[PDB]
Paper text:
TC-NER is initiated by the stalling of RNA polymerase II at DNA lesions, which triggers the assembly of the TC-NER-specific proteins CSA, CSB and UVSSA. CSA, a WD40-repeat containing protein, is the substrate receptor subunit of a cullin-RING ubiquitin ligase complex composed of DDB1, CUL4A/B and RBX1 (CRL4CSA). Functional analysis reveals that DDA1 coordinates ubiquitination dynamics during TC-NER and is required for efficient turnover and progression of this process.
To investigate the binding of DDA1 to CSA, we assembled part of the TC-NER ubiquitin ligase complex and determined its structure by cryo-EM at 3.4 Å resolution. The VHS domain of UVSSA (in pink) binds to a corner of CSA. In this structure we found DDA1 to interact with both DDB1 and CSA. The DDA1 binding groove of DCAF15 is not conserved in CSA, and we did not observe the full helix in the interaction with CSA. Instead, low-resolution densities were identified around blades 4 and 5 of the CSA β propeller. We could visualize DDA1 up to residue 61, but the region where it binds to CSA was poorly resolved and we could not build any model with confidence. By applying a mask and focused processing, we found that the densities in this area adopt multiple conformations, suggesting that the interaction is at low affinity and transient.
Author numbering:
A (entry chain D): 1 to 150
B (entry chain A): 1 to 232, 240 to 366
C (entry chain C): 2 to 21, 30 to 61
D (entry chain B): 1 to 744, 748 to 771, 777 to 1015, 1022 to 1140
The structure:
Amino acid sequence: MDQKLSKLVEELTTSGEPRLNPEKMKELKKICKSSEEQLSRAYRLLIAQLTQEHAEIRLSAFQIVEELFVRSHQFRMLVVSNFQEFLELTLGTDPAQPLPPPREAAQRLRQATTRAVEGWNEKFGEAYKKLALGYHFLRHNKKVDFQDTN
Amino acid sequence: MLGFLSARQTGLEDPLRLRRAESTRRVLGLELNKDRDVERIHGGGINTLDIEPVEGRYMLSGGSDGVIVLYDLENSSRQSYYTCKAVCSIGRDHPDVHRYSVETVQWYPHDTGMFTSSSFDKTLKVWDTNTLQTADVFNFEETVYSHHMSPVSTKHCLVAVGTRGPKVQLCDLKSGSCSHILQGHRQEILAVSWSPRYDYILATASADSRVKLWDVRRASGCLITLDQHNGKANTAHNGKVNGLCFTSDGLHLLTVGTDNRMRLWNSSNGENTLVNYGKVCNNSKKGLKFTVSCGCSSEFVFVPYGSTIAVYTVYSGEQITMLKGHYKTVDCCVFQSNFQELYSGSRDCNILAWVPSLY
Amino acid sequence: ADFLKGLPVYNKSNFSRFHARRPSVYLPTREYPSEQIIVTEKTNILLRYLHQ
Amino acid sequence: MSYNYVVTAQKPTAVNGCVTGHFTSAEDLNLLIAKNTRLEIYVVTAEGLRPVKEVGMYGKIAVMELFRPKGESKDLLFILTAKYNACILEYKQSGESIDIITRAHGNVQDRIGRPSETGIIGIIDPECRMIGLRLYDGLFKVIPLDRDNKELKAFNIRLEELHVIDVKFLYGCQAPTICFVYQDPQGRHVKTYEVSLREKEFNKGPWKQENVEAEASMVIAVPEPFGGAIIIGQESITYHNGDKYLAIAPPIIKQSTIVCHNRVDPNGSRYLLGDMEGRLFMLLLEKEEQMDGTVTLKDLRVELLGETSIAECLTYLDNGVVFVGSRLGDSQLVKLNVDSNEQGSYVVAMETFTNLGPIVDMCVVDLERQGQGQLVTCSGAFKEGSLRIIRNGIGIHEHASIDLPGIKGLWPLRSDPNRETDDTLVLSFVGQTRVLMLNGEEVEETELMGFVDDQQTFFCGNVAHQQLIQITSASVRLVSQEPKALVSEWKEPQAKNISVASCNSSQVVVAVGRALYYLQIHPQELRQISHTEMEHEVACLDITPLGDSNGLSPLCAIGLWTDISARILKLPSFELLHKEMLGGEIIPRSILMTTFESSHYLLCALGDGALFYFGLNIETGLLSDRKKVTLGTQPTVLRTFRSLSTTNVFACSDRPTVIYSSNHKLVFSNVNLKEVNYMCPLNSDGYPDSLALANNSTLTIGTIDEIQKLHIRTVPLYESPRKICYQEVSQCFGVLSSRIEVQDGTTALRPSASTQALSSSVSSSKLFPHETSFGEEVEVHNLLIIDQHTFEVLHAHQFLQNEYALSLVSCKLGKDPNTYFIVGTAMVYPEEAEPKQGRIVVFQYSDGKLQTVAEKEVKGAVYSMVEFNGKLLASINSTVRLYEWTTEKELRTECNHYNNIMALYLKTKGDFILVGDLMRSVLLLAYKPMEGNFEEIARDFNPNWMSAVEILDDDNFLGAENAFNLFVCQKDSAATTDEERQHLQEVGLFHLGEFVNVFCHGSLVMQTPTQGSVLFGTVNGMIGLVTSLSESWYNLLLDMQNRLNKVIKSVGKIEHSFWRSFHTERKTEPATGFIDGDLIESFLDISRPKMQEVVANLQYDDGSGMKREATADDLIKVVEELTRIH
C-alpha cells in the first residue's frame, strides 16, 4: 500500500502535465481516505516533492496539497503545522531560495498558491488564524499584489 | 501537579516552593496561544513592548510607523478566544504622533498615569494616560536610541538617554531639565539601564564594544568597565553591545552583542561569570530588547533569536527552548510575570502572545 | 547500650519528680528604651568593591 | 464597605523552633518553643516543663537563637520574623515583674532580592561576635555584635554561590568561618569562607572545595576538640576537617531523610538525628587521643535509638529527656533509657503535647444533636495522621466509679467534727436510703445511727451545734455529730408525708402538699417556728443564705404546681415578696438562690429543660431582668459547687451544664458527659476537691475544670487524611486517606487504619502500567467510613492502584432521595506532568455495607466538587462541568466552561458559584438554567495564588493567599456599567500570618453584635473565627485598636500595623476592613489605669445612637461580648 502511494505521488508529480490525471488523483484520494497514516505519508511525500528543483513537479505537488487541504481536515492540520516552509517552497518568499525553472511554470505556481492561500483565508481564517497571519505577512509586509496578473 | 498541592496543604514544602516550581513548569510550557490574540493595528514593525508595572494590565507597543498602542490585557470578552483590544492609540491622526519609529516606551515606575516614549524623531515625550496628551517634551541633537528611568528611584525621576551621540544624557523630569551629561563613550550608546538594586548606578553599552557602569553622584568618571577576559581586554563583546538588562535582583547583568554572544557579569565587581550561552544570533543594528523573568525558580532570559524567541537560563546557561511562530525577526519580548506570559512584537506588525499550556 | 551511657545531666533533680498547665500570656505595658537599633548600612557593595 | 473581625479560637500548636539554654537565669535550663507567632518559655524543673511565660510576637518566628556575648550573665535571644524584623531580647525578672527587654530591634529587609529556595537561615558565631543571615541568595547579611556603638550596622556580603543549600559557623577557627553546602550544575559542593569585619568581605576558607553527596542537605559544626564539620545527605554522613575526610554510608539511614539534629554532649561526641519517617538515631563520634595530646575523630557511627513522632526539631533537655518537637504530629517528651525494651526501642514516650495541625479539612457537626457544634478535623500526615474532635466544654477527671443503679439523691457528710473534710456519702433510692463511708479510697456500705434506711431521704447533712440532719418522706431527724443518736424528731401534725425539703445549717423549710413548715436548728431541738398553706401544691424549695446574713436566710424561694409560679417568701411570716409567673403547663422542679460575682440571682428550672434566671434583691425580694435558656429536654436538678474558691451551679440533666458568671453575665458551659441525674461536691482525703455524680445505673466520683475550653479528643488513623464530610443519614463520617506502601507487589510500612477496617473492599473499575522497582513507594488511597460514636473505621474501600482520591462530597443528587458519597479521583502516573484520566464514583453506605452505586469515567483530574441544586459541579483540569443524576443512576454531562485555568476551590450559595483559581484569584459564575453555560458574573484580575475561598454573603467573598494573607472582595452592584460590575473590588485586606487551608460555616458556641460566622483551619493547627460587624461597631473597634496600639508595647518593638499589613511579593498595603481580635481582647488584660488611658476620650454609642464618653467599663463590656462568640 505504501509503495502504491509513493508510486502514485511520483507519477502525479513527474508527469509534467499542466493538470493532474483525474483517475490517479481519485485513487490517491481513496488511499488518503483509507487511513490517516497513509494521509500523513502522502503529506510527507508531497513536502519532499516540493523540495525538488523542478517547477512542474512543485506545481503538481501544490495542486495535490490544495485538493487534500480542501477535502481533508488532518491534511489541513499538517499544512498549518509547516505553513512557513510550504510558503517558502511555493511562493519563493525567501530571496535566497528562488523558484526553480522553468520561469513560466514557477509563475503559474506562484499565481495558484496566491489564489489558494486567499481562498483558504476566506474559508477558514477565523479558525485557522495561523495561516491567516502568514497570509497578511506576505500581503502587506511582503507587498504581494493579489490583483497582479503575475 | 497534585503532589505540589498536597505538599502545600500538609506544610512539607513552604508555599514559595510550590509557587516557584509551578512558575518554572509554566514557563517551560510556553506556547503560541491560538485563542488569545492582539488586534493587528500597527502598519509596521514593533520596536518595543512594555507592560505597566503596578498591576500588569495595560501594555504599550511602539511601532516602526510611529504609532503607539495602549493594549489592554484584561480579558473582558469572557471568551477563551478573544482579541486584546487597543483601548487607545496615538496614530498619524493625533498631532503629537511620533513622525518616525518609536524605539522604546516605558511607563512611570511610580505612577501608572504617565509614560515615556522616545523616537527616531530626536525627541523623548512624556504622555499621561487620562488624556493621552504629551505632558512634556525633550529634544536632543541625536536620535534617542534608548531611554530608561530608574525603577528603584523615588528621590529623583532621572531619565537616562542614549543617542547616536557618544555622550549619555541625564534629564530630570521633576525639574524639567536636561542638565546632566556623562562622557567617556566613543560612539552611539545603544542601551542604558539603571540598576534595580542600586539607585544611582547606570549601565551603558555602545557599539564601541564596551559596557561602562557609572555612578551619577560622581559626575567625574565611570565606575567600572566590563571585560570578557578579566584582564588575562576592557571590552564586553567583539562587536556592538546592542542589548543590556540587569537580572531581577540586580546582582548580575546580561549583555547581548552583535558578535552573537550573550554574556553574564557580576554587577558588584564586573567580571565575566563565563556562562556559555552559545551562539545567540543577533544581527540587529538597533538596540535589541530582551527581558528576564521574575519570581521563578530559575531566572529565564528571553532573547530575540532571529525570528524565534530563545529562552535560556540566567544561572546555568542551558537553552530552555526556542519558541517559534513569528514570520519576521522578533524585535521586542516583554514578560508578564503575573501569569508567566510572554508578548513578542516582531517586525511583521504582529503581537504574538505566548502562554503556559499544560493540557 | 554502651553509647547511651553518659548522656550529660545538667542537674540531677531535673525531671526527677516528673508528673504526666499552659503558660500565662505575657502582655507588657511598660516600655524600656531599646538600647540599640539595627540599620542596614546603605554602602553600595559594588562601589566598595571597585574602590577596594 | 465591608467590616470583619478575626479572632484565634485555638492558638497554633505546630512547633516551629526549639532551643535550650539559660534564658531566665544563668543557673536555670530554659526551653524556648516557637509556635508560629507564639514563644513559650518553660523551665526544666524536677516536676517537668514548668511554663514560665508565653510571649506573643507580631511576626512569624523564622529564626531563634540563644547567644551569650562575653560579659553577659545569661543568654540573650535573637528572633528574626518572616517579615524580616530582627530583635535581640533578654529576660529580666525583678521580683514578680517579668519583662522581655528588647535590647536591639530593627528591620533587615532589603528592597529587592530573591527569597532563598531553602528559606531564611540565621546563624551566630561560637564566640557570639556577629549574626549571619542568609535571606536572599547571593547576599549574606552580617550584623556585628558590638556593644559600645548604639547602632548595629548590618551589611551585605556577596556570595558567588547563588544556590546555597545550607550554612553554618565553624568552631575551631580563629576568624569567623562559615562552612556552607551549595549547589550548581556540576553538583553540590561544601565550601569555606572567612568573614572579615574590617574588610566586610569573604576570604578564602581554611579547607579546599570538596564534592559531597548529591543530596548533601545539612551541615553540623562539631565543636572542640574535633573541629571541622559534618555533612549529612541522604545515604552518606561525611566529616570534613581540612584534609581529614571521613565518610560512612549506613543502610539504615538511606530509608528516610534526616531533617533535624541536636548536640547531646557539649564536646560533640554524641548527636541526635531525626528522620521524616519519625525514626530517631544517635550519631557517635569516636574521639581518639594522639600521644601528643590532640584529640581527633576516629570514626562515625549511627545507631537507630527508636521511633518517635515525626521530628521537626529535636532538643536534648536534660537527664536523658529529649523534647521531640513535631509539626506533622503531636509534640513529644521522650526518655532515652540505657536499656532497650523488648521491642528493641530505647525511646519511652514520657509525655505528649497535642498538635492540631496541619488541618487539611474539617467539618462542624452536631454529633451530639444537642446544638453544640463540634469540630471534626483531619490533622497530621503519614503515620501521624488522625482525626481531632474539638468539643467545647468542661471536662471531668473521675477517680472512682461504683455500680449503683437507680440513685435518687446524693449528699456529702462530715462524721467527725474535728476532721474538716467529708468522710461520708449518703445515697437515696426507692423509698430507702444508703450510707457510704470514705476511708481514703475505700467506698463501702454502712449504717448510720439516727438515720433510717427504710425511708427515702430528701436531704441530709451537717447542721449547727455539732449536729447532723436527715429529712425523709416520714419526718426530719436531728442527730448529734459526735454521738450518732437521734436527738430530735419532727413530724407533720397528722403524721402526713413530707413532700419537699430544703435546709441550710440553721434552718429547715419543708412542704407537706400545700403546707409549709419553717423549723430552726437548736441544741437537741427542731424548733417549729411558723407554718403556712400555699395557694397550690409545692413543687420545689430553697433557703440558701445570701450576702451578709450569717447562715440565716430571711428568704425562702418556692416553686408551685398548677400556677407554675416562682415565689419569694419572707421568713418567718411567709409573706409574699414577689410572685413570678413562669408560663406553660410544666411545673418547676428545681429552684435556687445564688451569688455570682457579688450579684444575687434566682435560678428556676422547669421539667421541660427550660431555665429561668433573675436578678434578686435580698432586702426587697425583688426579681428583675428575666432571662430564659434551654438546657436539654429532661428536668434539671440544680446544685452549687465551689471550684477554685468560686461559686458555680451544676445543672444535672440530659445535658450536664455548669452555670457561672463572667463579667457580670451568666455563662453556660456544657459538661462532657452523656447525662447526669444528681450531683454533689465531695472533699474527702482519698477524693479531695472532687464531685460525686450519678446517672441511671452508675455512681462516679471525679474532679472538674474551673471553666471551659476546646477539649480535643484524638482518633489515630496512621495514614494521611485529606478530606472529610459528614453523612447525617447513615451516622457515618467519610474520610479520604492515603498511605505509603513500599514495593515488595507492595507492602505497607506499618499497620494503619485502612488495613484493620472491620470490612475492607477494593474498587475494580473496568474503565481502565509501570514496573515499580523494589523499594519504590506507592500511594494507596482509601475511603474510610467511620462510625460517629465509636469513631472506628467500620469500612475501608481501597481505590485502584495509582489512583488518588482528590474530592469528596456527601449529598443527594437530582430527585434521588438517597444520600451518596460522591468521590472524585485521578490517576497519577509518575511520568505525566498532569493526570490524563480520572473518574467520579458514587457510593452508598447502606445497611452497614458500602456499595459502588455508580461510576463515570472522565478525562482529567476531579480537583473539587460541590452540590449545586441537585447537580454535580465538577472541576476537571482546566474545565468546570455540570452533571445531572439521571433515572438510571448515572451522570450526564450538560455543559462545560473553559474560562478557568484551574478551579481548585469551589463554593456555592443560591445561584452563585465562587471559583478559586490556582493563580487567577477568585471568579464568580452564575449557571444558566435556560441556555446551559456558566456566565462569569464577575472576577478579580489581581494575580493571587489562592488557598481557600468562602462566601460571607451574597456580596462579600472571603479568600486566602499563598503568602499568609486574607482578603474580602465585593461584587460592585452599585456599578452602572457591565465593566465595573465584572470587577470584584478588594474591599478588605489582612495578614493573618497563617496558611489557612479550609473554611467552614458554623460556630462552636451554644446559640448579637457580630453576625455570621466562619471557622478556618491552618497548617499550624490554628483555628480562627471570622465574623461580620456593624459600621458603628467596626468604627469603634478600629479606634480602640489604634489606641491599644498606642498603649500596648509589642515585644521586639514591631508595629501591629506593620505586622497585619497585607504583604505579598508584588505588593504591600496596610490592613483594612478587618479588626484584629487578639489585640482587642487583650483590652481585658490591661490594668485599670491602662484601661482608663485606652478609653480616654472615646466617642461611643451606648445603644441610644448618641456619642457618649466611652469609659473603661463600657469598652470592657464591649470586649466581653466579642469574646463570648468564640
